[PDB]
Amino acid sequence: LVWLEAMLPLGIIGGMLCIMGNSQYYIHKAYHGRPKHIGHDEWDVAMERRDKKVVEKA
Amino acid sequence: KDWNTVFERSINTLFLTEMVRGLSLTLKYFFDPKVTINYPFEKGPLSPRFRGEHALRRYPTGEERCIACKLCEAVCPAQAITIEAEEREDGSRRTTRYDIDMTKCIYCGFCQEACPVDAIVEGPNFEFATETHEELLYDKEKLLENGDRWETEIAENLRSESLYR
Amino acid sequence: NIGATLVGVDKFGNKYYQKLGDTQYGRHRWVEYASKDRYNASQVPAEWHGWLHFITDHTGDELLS
Amino acid sequence: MILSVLSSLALVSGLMVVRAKNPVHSVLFFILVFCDTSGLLLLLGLDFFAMIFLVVYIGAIAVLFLFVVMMFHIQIALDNESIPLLPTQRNTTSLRYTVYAGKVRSWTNLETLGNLLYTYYFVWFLVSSLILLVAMIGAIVLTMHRT
Amino acid sequence: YIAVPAEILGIILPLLLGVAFLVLAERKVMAFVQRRKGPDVVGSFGLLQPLADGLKLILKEPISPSSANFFLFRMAPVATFMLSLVAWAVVPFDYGMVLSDLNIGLLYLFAISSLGVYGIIIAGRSSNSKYAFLGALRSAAQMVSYEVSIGLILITVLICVGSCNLSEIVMAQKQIWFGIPLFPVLVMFFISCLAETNRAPFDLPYSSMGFALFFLGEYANMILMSGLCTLFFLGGWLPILDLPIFKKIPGSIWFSIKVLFFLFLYIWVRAAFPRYRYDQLMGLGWKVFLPLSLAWVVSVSGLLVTFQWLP
Amino acid sequence: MMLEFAPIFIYLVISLLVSLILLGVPFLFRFDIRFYLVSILFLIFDLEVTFFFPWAVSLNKIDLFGFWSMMAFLFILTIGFLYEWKRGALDW
Amino acid sequence: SKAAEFVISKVDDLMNWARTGSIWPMTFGLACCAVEMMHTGAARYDLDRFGIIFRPSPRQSDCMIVAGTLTNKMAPALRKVYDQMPEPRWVISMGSCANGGGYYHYSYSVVRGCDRIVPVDIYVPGCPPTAEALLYGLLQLQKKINRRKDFLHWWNK
Ligand SMILES: CCCCCCCCCCCCCCCCCCCC(=O)O[C@H](COC(=O)CCCCCCCCCCCCCC)COP(=O)(O)OCCN
Ligand code: SF4
Ligand code: SF4
């Protein structure tokens, strides 16, 4: 009613946080086609490598 | 003392219960109307007795009220007034030079209350900050211009305190 | 300037508004300057200066007469 | 490549440490030495140890040395064991056998260390604790002047 | 692979804009708390004030205080800027919206926080003013003494998760947020972050871009600690615990909302309470938070082990 | 496994570049002993937290033996901290 | 001059807009005019609302409000503080005492005006000046700043 004028810069901060979060979700996806996977272990790394080799082969 | 009292005052020490009581007050004041004013648009309240910029008044016939009695110059505690007088062509007692040092003026209103003819008054104007020092050395022409520019408000105020002065 | 009453118009085009207060006051006597070029911060004539600063209750149109 | 430069900078920083006029510059190059050593450890896959080197060496010891130098005076001053493999990796890179049995459940350097640091070798852990307690006790007795 | 600088720019520039608007938000919220209004003339609601401030500090024709080595003095703000921004490469905003997914993220954050002591120290000595040197020394000691408690609280959180991956700590709170059981731990963490940043009752304290970089680094640290507070205890990007019909809201919005709530708590706390004294800062931080953090670590580990509720 | 540090290194390089750009923006146109005691205590407790780091993650494999080993470690450092306390090294 | 008369004008307008929108004065409180300055920055008049925020040190302030009686013993410190501010700096004299000595003009230990020690840009009259009078003085200083043409004059020489 009167307190919303102090929520404008505070909401701008939230918009900045959202844009930082969403920039990497549409830039990393742009050159990979897949969202980043959390929890990369050596099994996952080797298995993505095998994916790359098999895709290159056929 | 009591175990109950020890427990009660140890909890308040650890749970910060006397700081939540201050946070609540500040938050309650957060959602409240503000009391700030838009200075360029709305001005703060004043009084008809307000002592602001000086002005030299004149009679409705167009004759200046100042009779060069120098009674305001002798009461001025700051010695901010200098008056030179002589006999005019008509033989009337009038001032040739009437200048006020606004850098010496203390805005006490002694000159206004000492004038026997209500010639010198302090108008309601308080917004006259200048960019140069000698623009604050008001002379007779400047004071008369102030009186002509603020004549209606000065007259209304002097009418208001006719019941008090 | 919303839910407000226009008291009068000045020779310079300035518009004077008023709102009714109950117990705490606020935004009840202000001016909408007719200019926007920095507005010079001092453009209120003597007849409207007293009304704006609550010195007198006369609007300024009544102060002329 | 990355190893060569990250070792060269560390050697230069150490040389400046042992040959520094102003001790503050010596402390700064001392910090740079461990900054490079952390990257060198990172190249080995010991992510935990590099982070601890950052935390311990240039987080506690370097800060302590800086405190001492600043506020006090700032005064003036091969073929036998492991024969190297020659660069023949055009065919060696193809001859890399990967066993997926060891990758199905892979431990991090942290949990691999913590699996045996606290159960199978706990006495050494407590001896290090006693060393820390000795340091705590000896810091006070040497340097303490109340009121 | 040339798009990594695009990601770094997209995470760095909005961070600076958010820092400027956080300064504006602080100056507005304090004005609203004290029955006035913040900067309002410059913008529609003061939103243009930070840009005017930036152009002012840029266009000042300032002089460099070359009465020193001129290298350490000029690089100390640069170093603290390094450390303040580098910690944002691991903080996740949603499921897969993290720049660098480390498996040692908690320890990397601890290292970055512990390495922030050098900038203020170098700035303190490089300035020939002895009194500024002593003030920087005191601030460094305070940051150290509360970083200890921050690390212990990190241990308390890490026990219940079992992994140092930040993006997995959030996923571990799918059942309930860690702020509900460990509420005293959350309060202690918030207070320690207040003392770590030289802020709130814990805030005891040259020109142009050096001071600008120090100011920006301090406010970026404030934002980062609010993010950590919502990341370890408030569930990160996870939605509200109950009523799962609003799931159309992206997870990145919830993280932002909780961060804004914690920033409001920073501004609120600094506005509502007076300052502590140095002889009380150290006593408090070494006698009220270290024992409590250690006791909470012991209690959580003992309770989880007893009932075999470990990860 | 360690491929996730290259983004951090490039981030450091670009942060350096933007900091240098910011610096170039305006260019175009006695002794107290308690400060040593606090550092000593910080070093000791930083090592303690370092030792907590492996214990917290691997608390599921070790069980009722690693927990009590950590408890003995904590007891020794707590005796040391109590000695620090009563000796007045924590006061100012 | 096909675009210099335009581009230089716009960049100079941007410079003036920044300088008017963000003024950081250094309040030099000396006497009862300090009370009026504190009242101006309080909730009623809200000097912050225009972007003005006070600063403690002269390193970070581009304006300097001398408000109080300047004595002979204090003038060297006044000048030293003035000499420490960066180049685009302005001085505002507030009250009769700072303007011309005021009510202690004929004293043996009073400097008859702060303009004998530092160059003054705006004189605010009063004893003490009203808080709205100080608002008017700051607005006049803003109006004077908008008159500056730094980039055009630099181009013309
Ligand atoms: C959803 C979001 C919710 C909010 C999240 C944020 C929460 C914080 C919000 C703001 C709270 C107020 C912040 C004020 C900041 C400054 C406060 C510092 C004051 C302080 O440190 O108090 C000390 C003691 O109290 C203390 O020790 C304080 C720490 C106590 C932690 C709680 C420990 C309780 C343990 C109970 C366990 C029971 C459950 C488990 C079985 C000193 O006080 P003193 O002067 O008396 O000196 C003690 C000598 N003896
Ligand atoms: S108001 Fe007082 S100080 Fe000013 S001219 Fe009148 S008598 Fe003199
Ligand atoms: S202004 Fe009044 S008091 Fe002063 S000389 Fe004229 S008539 Fe006399």
Ligand code: SF4
């Ligand atoms: S001008 Fe008046 S109010 Fe201001 S310092 Fe001088 S005597 Fe005091």
